[PDB]
Amino acid sequence: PFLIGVSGGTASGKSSVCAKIVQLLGQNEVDYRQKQVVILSQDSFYRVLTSEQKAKALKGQFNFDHPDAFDNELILKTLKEITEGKTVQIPVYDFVSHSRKEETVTVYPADVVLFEGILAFYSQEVRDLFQMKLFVDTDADTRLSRRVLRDISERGRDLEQILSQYITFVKPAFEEFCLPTKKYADVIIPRGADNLVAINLIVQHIQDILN
Amino acid sequence: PFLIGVSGGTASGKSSVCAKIVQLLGQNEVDYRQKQVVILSQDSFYRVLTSEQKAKALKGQFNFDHPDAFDNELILKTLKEITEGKTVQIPVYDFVSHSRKEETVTVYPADVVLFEGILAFYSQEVRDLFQMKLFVDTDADTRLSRRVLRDISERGRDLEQILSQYITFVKPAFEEFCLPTKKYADVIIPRGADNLVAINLIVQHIQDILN
Amino acid sequence: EPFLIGVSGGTASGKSSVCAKIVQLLGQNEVDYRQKQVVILSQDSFYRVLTSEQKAKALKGQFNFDHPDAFDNELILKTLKEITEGKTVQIPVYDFVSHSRKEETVTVYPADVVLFEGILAFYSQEVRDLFQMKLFVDTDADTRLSRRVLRDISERGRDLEQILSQYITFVKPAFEEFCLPTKKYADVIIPRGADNLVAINLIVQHIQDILNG
Amino acid sequence: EPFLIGVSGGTASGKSSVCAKIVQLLGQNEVDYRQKQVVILSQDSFYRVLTSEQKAKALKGQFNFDHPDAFDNELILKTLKEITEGKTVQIPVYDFVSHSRKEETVTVYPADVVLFEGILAFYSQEVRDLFQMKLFVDTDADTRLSRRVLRDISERGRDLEQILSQYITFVKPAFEEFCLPTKKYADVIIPRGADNLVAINLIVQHIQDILNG
Numbered sequence: 041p042f043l044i045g046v047s048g049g050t051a052s053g054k055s056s057v058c059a060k061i062v063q064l065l066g067q068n069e070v071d072y073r074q075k076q077v078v079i080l081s082q083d084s085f086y087r088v089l090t091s092e093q094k095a096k097a098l099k100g101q102f103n104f105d106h107p108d109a110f111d112n113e114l115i116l117k118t119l120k121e122i123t124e125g126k127t128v129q130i131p132v133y134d135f136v137s138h139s140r141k142e143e144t145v146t147v148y149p150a151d152v153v154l155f156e157g158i159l160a161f162y163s164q165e166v167r168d169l170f171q172m173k174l175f176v177d178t179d180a181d182t183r184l185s186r187r188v189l190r191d192i193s194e195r196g197r198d199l200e201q202i203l204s205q206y207i208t209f210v211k212p213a214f215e216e217f218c219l220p221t222k223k224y225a226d227v228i229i230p231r232g233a234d235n236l237v238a239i240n241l242i243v244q245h246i247q248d249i250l251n
Numbered sequence: 252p253f254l255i256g257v258s259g260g261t262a263s264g265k266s267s268v269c270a271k272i273v274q275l276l277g278q279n280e281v282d283y284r285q286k287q288v289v290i291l292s293q294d295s296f297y298r299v300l301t302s303e304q305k306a307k308a309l310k311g312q313f314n315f316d317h318p319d320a321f322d323n324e325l326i327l328k329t330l331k332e333i334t335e336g337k338t339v340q341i342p343v344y345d346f347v348s349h350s351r352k353e354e355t356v357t358v359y360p361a362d363v364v365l366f367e368g369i370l371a372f373y374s375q376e377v378r379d380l381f382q383m384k385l386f387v388d389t390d391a392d393t394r395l396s397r398r399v400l401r402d403i404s405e406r407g408r409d410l411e412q413i414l415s416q417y418i419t420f421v422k423p424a425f426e427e428f429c430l431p432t433k434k435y436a437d438v439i440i441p442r443g444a445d446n447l448v449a450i451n452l453i454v455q456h457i458q459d460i461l462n
Numbered sequence: 463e464p465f466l467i468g469v470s471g472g473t474a475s476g477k478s479s480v481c482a483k484i485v486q487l488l489g490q491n492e493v494d495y496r497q498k499q500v501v502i503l504s505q506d507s508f509y510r511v512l513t514s515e516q517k518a519k520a521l522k523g524q525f526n527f528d529h530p531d532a533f534d535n536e537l538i539l540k541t542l543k544e545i546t547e548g549k550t551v552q553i554p555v556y557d558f559v560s561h562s563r564k565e566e567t568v569t570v571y572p573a574d575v576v577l578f579e580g581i582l583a584f585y586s587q588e589v590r591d592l593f594q595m596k597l598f599v600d601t602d603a604d605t606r607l608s609r610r611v612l613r614d615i616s617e618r619g620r621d622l623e624q625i626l627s628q629y630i631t632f633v634k635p636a637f638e639e640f641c642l643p644t645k646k647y648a649d650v651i652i653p654r655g656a657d658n659l660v661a662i663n664l665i666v667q668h669i670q671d672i673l674n675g
Numbered sequence: 676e677p678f679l680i681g682v683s684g685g686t687a688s689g690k691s692s693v694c695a696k697i698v699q700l701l702g703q704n705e706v707d708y709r710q711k712q713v714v715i716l717s718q719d720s721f722y723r724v725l726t727s728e729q730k731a732k733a734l735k736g737q738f739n740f741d742h743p744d745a746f747d748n749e750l751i752l753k754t755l756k757e758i759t760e761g762k763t764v765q766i767p768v769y770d771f772v773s774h775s776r777k778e779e780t781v782t783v784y785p786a787d788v789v790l791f792e793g794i795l796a797f798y799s800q801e802v803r804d805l806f807q808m809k810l811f812v813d814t815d816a817d818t819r820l821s822r823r824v825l826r827d828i829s830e831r832g833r834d835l836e837q838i839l840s841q842y843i844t845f846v847k848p849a850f851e852e853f854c855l856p857t858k859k860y861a862d863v864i865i866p867r868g869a870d871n872l873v874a875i876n877l878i879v880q881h882i883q884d885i886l887n888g
């Protein structure tokens with residue numbers, strides 16, 4: 041399986057870029073079991089929160105941007121099995137309640153796997169599993185604007201709590217943990233999903249692999 | 252009169268820095284006519300909008316961040332008279348209605364004048380009237396967060412229109428017109444009003460001038 | 463119609479080497495001159511002819527070869543336009559050692575893909591719109607200054623102190639004022655220049671696909 | 676208690692010259708050694724003693740003098756602490772030419788104001804908290820590389836290629852990893868280094884005020 045790692049800051053466009061790639065590849069018109077290109081999100085691997093942690097999260101006082109927030113062991117284990125051509129089950133994360141669902145997603149063997157997340161390149165062992173590394177680079181202020189609108193209409197958050205959480209944990213964590221991984225990227229994609237030339241370049245490359 | 256120019260991006264903390272300086276100098280406990288240090292805002296010199304312009308402004312589709320948005324002639328004329336020790340009248344701008352008020356402010360001769368604005372260093376003639384140039388440097392994302400809260404509670408704006416206006420005009424104008432003037436600053440003050448050491452340095456310097 | 467790819471980046475960013483590598487990997491350095499499917503055009507080939515006093519200053523590293531005015535922008539646009547029309551063009555040959563245009567020229571026959579590289583390839587809107595793909599080779603300024611020093615001393619017969627003087631006085635200011643503002647027009651940013659094998663192979667594959675149909 | 680001012684910035688940013696200018700303008704280069712009211716301490720005075728193989732590597736520009744481990748951080752903290760206690764201290768003298776600590780030393784008597792400058796002056800939290808004011812001299816990396824090259828060749832007897840190698844391999848990476856992250860701790864940022872007369876006079880006036888009472 042050809043693994044492509046995608047990173048970038050929060051709301052940089054990582055998710056929309058991956059979605060557009062599979063969409064342009066016609067994967068949305070293919071049966072779930074027949075998909076040749078699948079998208080795996082790092083957010084699906086957020087650790088289960090403890091009572092105290094969830095309490096803070098509800099107040100926007102928990103650091104979901106720190107490397108420890110993700111179950112790195114599970115991520116590595118899952119990606120390795122995928123590279124081995126095995127079928128795996130991945131967790132389903134609910135941003136609204138800061139928790140997992142009892143339902144999991146079946147990830148069948150695909151020819152190409154897109155793994156995206158704010159800290160997809162943080163771990164060296166994970167990084168070495170990617171045959172290609174893309175980093176979506178979008179200005180911090182632009183990303184904040186996007187996150188505010190997205191979080192309010194999709195993650196059930198409030199403006200003030202969003203800005204507070206962002207300035208207190210998100211911004212600092214981005215500079216300390218995310219930004220430093222940009223150097224590992226092979227190709228930088230500015231702006232995001234509206235960058236059609238960049239997206240089509242990845243699509244053609246993937247299509248070439250499928251053939 | 253000792254003129255101090257202060258610039259920086261929107262919501263960088265220019266206004267709060269100047270306010271804190273005069274506050275620490277005890278100027279808030281001095282009668283209006285007796286003030287030795289006065290603050291002049293560049294926003295007071297926004298040009299009067301035409302019908303079409305105001306219509307766009309209401310939609311957040313007018314560029315208030317472009318150099319042309321300010322009456323540069325009036326600014327230069329006013330600052331020159333101030334350097335001449337003359338009493339002048341300055342306009343009063345209402346951000347809520349995107350317009351001036353019929354009432355003006357009397358600016359009496361002061362020993363020290365603080366002139367602050369996003370484009371205070373844009374004009375060379377104006378820039379040369381400043382004996383000291385300060386630039387308040389605060390990260391773009393941090394400034395956006397501040398502007399959103401400020402604009403909503405002080406300028407009668409709506410979140411969506413604020414983000415739209417910011418991404419469409421504010422951000423581009425900052426990079427093209429404001430940021431390039433940072434090189435003219437003598438001293439850079441990071442973060443803003445919470446930077447007590449920096450503020451106290453300016454206060455002591457001004458106090459030295461007053462003596 | 464020819465597929466034009468614009469490539470920019472600061473001096474010594476790796477632009478030239480990246481383009482050379484791509485063309486080499488495409489096996490074009492084997493194809494007949496008149497059968498070339500992928501060619502490279504350099505913006506430096508269009509540097510203007512210097513006058514007597516200009517060349518004198520250049521000999522002292524006192525001429526600004528980094529300002530848009532240093533290039534014959536009209537000739538660049540006309541040439542690119544003629545290329546998109548499938549016409550054979552004549553390109554000048556520049557000599558960095560003598561700061562002059564050589565008498566010898568390079569004829570470029572109709573190609574399927576054209577790579578145009580230069581420190582200011584994205585400066586002109588008209589030129590930019592002629593590119594179907596825009597790549598920016600991003601390499602830190604301090605890294606590029608190191609590379610430029612070694613290159614100019616060993617290849618362009620320049621003196622160390624003159625290189626640093628020229629760099630601080632003209633190269634750096636012009637890059638920040640005229641080149642940096644154009645980075646936003648690039649579709650893809652390529653780091654580590656010529657050593658970025660993944661990025662290079664990606665472009666090669668894309669071009670090979672365009673050639674196949 | 677002595678008023679400590681920490682000063683940082685990358686190599687050749689103008690840190691040393693700024694501090695020297697301030698002290699000169701304060702008329703301290705006239706005051707008796709034992710009557711000095713304002714003194715300057717350099718972090719480079721605390722570079723560690725190199726072993727046989729370390730010095731050999733250093734002679735080839737293969738040793739990392741930019742990593743926090745290159746300095747005797749404990750001696751720095753102890754010395755600063757003793758200074759804040761109003762005690763007379765003994766400071767080592769470093770020789771950049773031989774990569775070694777000299778046998779001669781500089782005695783620093785109780786001062787009212789102390790300037791501590793170094794490429795990593797803000798790296799240690801304990802050290803940072805000892806500063807009542809933190810200044811960062813911000814000068815672009817390419818500008819600093821140019822200055823460093825000229826300085827090392829003419830003052831530290833280094834070879835051009837070795838300087839560039841050392842810079843790309845250690846100086847640049849260490850600056851970005853260890854120094855840049857500390858810039859956020861500075862209270863005031865000073866651009867244009869030693870040529871910034873306004874900023875320098877501002878600091879001088881502030882210090883003179885502290886001395887007057």
Ligand SMILES: Nc1ncnc2c1ncn2[C@@H]1O[C@H](COP(=O)(O)OP(=O)(O)O)[C@@H](O)[C@H]1O
Pocket residue numbers: 048049050051052053054055056057186187189190231232233234
């Ligand atoms: N070009 C664009 N213009 C406007 N909104 C955009 C653009 N690209 C992305 N967005 C919006 O930004 C938000 C975050 O994008 P997303 O793709 O989820 O990024 P990430 O995966 O990096 O967090 C979404 O609400 C998305 O619709």
Ligand SMILES: Nc1ncnc2c1ncn2[C@@H]1O[C@H](COP(=O)(O)OP(=O)(O)O)[C@@H](O)[C@H]1O
Pocket residue numbers: 259260261262263264265266267268397398400401442443444445
């Ligand atoms: N350190 C700070 N922490 C939180 N909010 C701040 C801080 N500094 C400024 N602000 C807020 O940011 C907004 C913009 O600051 P302002 O001083 O008006 O800046 P400017 O004059 O540059 O537009 C205000 O609502 C202000 O209260």
Ligand SMILES: Nc1ncnc2c1ncn2[C@@H]1O[C@H](COP(=O)(O)OP(=O)(O)O)[C@@H](O)[C@H]1O
Pocket residue numbers: 471472473474475476477478479480609610612613655656657
């Ligand atoms: N990975 C690398 N490491 C060190 N030097 C390099 C590297 N890649 C290129 N160079 C050197 O950098 C100089 C400029 O590279 P070049 O490809 O011509 O860039 P540009 O076209 O942007 O000027 C050359 O002298 C080249 O040998």
Ligand SMILES: Nc1ncnc2c1ncn2[C@@H]1O[C@H](COP(=O)(O)OP(=O)(O)O)[C@@H](O)[C@H]1O
Pocket residue numbers: 684685686687688689690691692693822823825826868869870
């Ligand atoms: N304005 C300037 N223009 C050119 N060179 C300068 C300037 N200011 C300082 N330099 C040179 O830069 C080098 C380093 O300056 P220095 O003050 O020692 O900085 P730092 O203490 O940060 O290493 C010296 O060789 C000095 O002569």
Ligand SMILES: Nc1ccn([C@@H]2O[C@H](COP(=O)(O)O)[C@@H](O)[C@H]2O)c(=O)n1
Pocket residue numbers: 049050051054055083086097104105134135137138139157158210
């Ligand atoms: N429960 C959770 C889990 C993650 N997050 C935020 O989600 C982000 C990562 O997702 P994106 O890449 O979709 O922005 C982080 O920056 C983290 O702040 C959250 O706000 N609440």
Ligand SMILES: Nc1ccn([C@@H]2O[C@H](COP(=O)(O)O)[C@@H](O)[C@H]2O)c(=O)n1
Pocket residue numbers: 260261262265266294297308315316345346348349350368369421
């Ligand atoms: N009528 C007006 C006039 C100015 N402005 C905005 O006010 C800003 C400048 O003020 P601050 O420095 O207070 O942020 C600009 O960035 C401009 O966008 C506005 O939003 N409506």
Ligand SMILES: Nc1ccn([C@@H]2O[C@H](COP(=O)(O)O)[C@@H](O)[C@H]2O)c(=O)n1
Pocket residue numbers: 472473474475478506509520527528557558560561562580581633
């Ligand atoms: N005669 C000339 C013409 C150009 N140049 C320099 O050549 C550079 C562009 O070449 P590269 O793209 O090969 O780096 C410019 O930065 C310009 O300074 C020069 O140093 N002498």
Ligand SMILES: Nc1ccn([C@@H]2O[C@H](COP(=O)(O)O)[C@@H](O)[C@H]2O)c(=O)n1
Pocket residue numbers: 685686687688691719722733740741770771773774775793794846
């Ligand atoms: N023996 C030594 C000790 C330090 N250094 C360099 O000296 C620098 C710090 O000096 P400045 O602050 O004077 O620039 C570092 O960047 C370190 O590389 C050296 O080149 N040889």
Ligand SMILES: [Mg+2]
Pocket residue numbers: 051054055
């Ligand atoms: Mg996402």
Ligand SMILES: [Mg+2]
Pocket residue numbers: 262265266
């Ligand atoms: Mg304001």
Ligand SMILES: [Mg+2]
Pocket residue numbers: 478504506
């Ligand atoms: Mg070339």
Ligand SMILES: [Mg+2]
Pocket residue numbers: 691717719
């Ligand atoms: Mg020193």
